[PDB]
Amino acid sequence: GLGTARLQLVEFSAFVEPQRHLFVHISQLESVDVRQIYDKFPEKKGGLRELYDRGPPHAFFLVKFWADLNWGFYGVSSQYESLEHMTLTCSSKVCSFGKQVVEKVETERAQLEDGRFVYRLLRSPMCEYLVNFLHKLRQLPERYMMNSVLENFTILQVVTNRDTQELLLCTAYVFEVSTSERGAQHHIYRLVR
């Protein structure tokens, strides 16, 4: 599972609507050495290397997506849950060739449902930089070219307890493209050193 004692990812998805199309989808464990990816994110140092030093290390995950790009409103939907009532800050950074080019900061209040608290961030509009980027990527004539382009782009999500500023979840994403026959796919990994 992608999660800690305090906070779990229930569902994640990114999509376009005119019946929607999902680029990637997680509905709800191998490891990887964070040193192998230090370079994919800034040495900002709000990038990965510094965050990991201050831990906790069990809070840090890597997701590799093989996206489905064969298909307007662009959106992202996240759902988390916990047994504690919290307020969350969710920070998402896009990084391109080592440099942070987007930062999006959102908060969500716990909601009571079925004996647990859920934190629903639903249909957030995907930022414009990403929509435009996806429209170009969609044009490329060959899957191997898309992957070459995508090798230089990563996303980092940082979820903290807003009232204590404790990190609860830190997730790095990296991306390739799948063929239409093989649909979207993901693999989740703990990060270690």
Ligand X SMILES: O=C(O)c1ccccc1Nc1cccc(C(F)(F)F)c1
Strand runs (DSSP E) across the chain, as ranges?
Answer: 8-17, 21-27, 31-33, 60-67, 73-82, 87-96, 99-109, 111-113, 116-125, 153-161, 167-177, 185-192
User: Which structure tokens are listed for 146?
Assistant: 């898309």
x/- map, 46-85, ligand X, by CB under 6 A: ------------------------------x---------
Select from 2, 9, 14, 90 the one that contacts ligand X (CB under 6 A): 14
Peptide bond into 45 cis (omega under 30): yes
Cβ nearer to ligand X, comparing 85 with 135: 135
Cβ nearer to ligand X, comparing 5 with 105: 105
Per CB under 6 A, the segment of 2-10, 34-42, 90-98, 161-169 that binds ligand X is 90-98
Sheet holding 87-96, edge to edge: 31-33, 185-192, 60-67, 167-177, 153-161, 87-96, 99-109
Cβ nearer to ligand X, comparing 52 with 133: 133
Per CB under 6 A, the segment of 31-39, 122-130, 142-150, 158-166 that binds ligand X is 122-130
Cβ nearer to ligand X, comparing 24 with 59: 24
Q: Which residues bind to ligand X, rule: CB under 6 A?
A: 14, 23-24, 76, 92-94, 102, 104, 126-127, 130, 155, 173
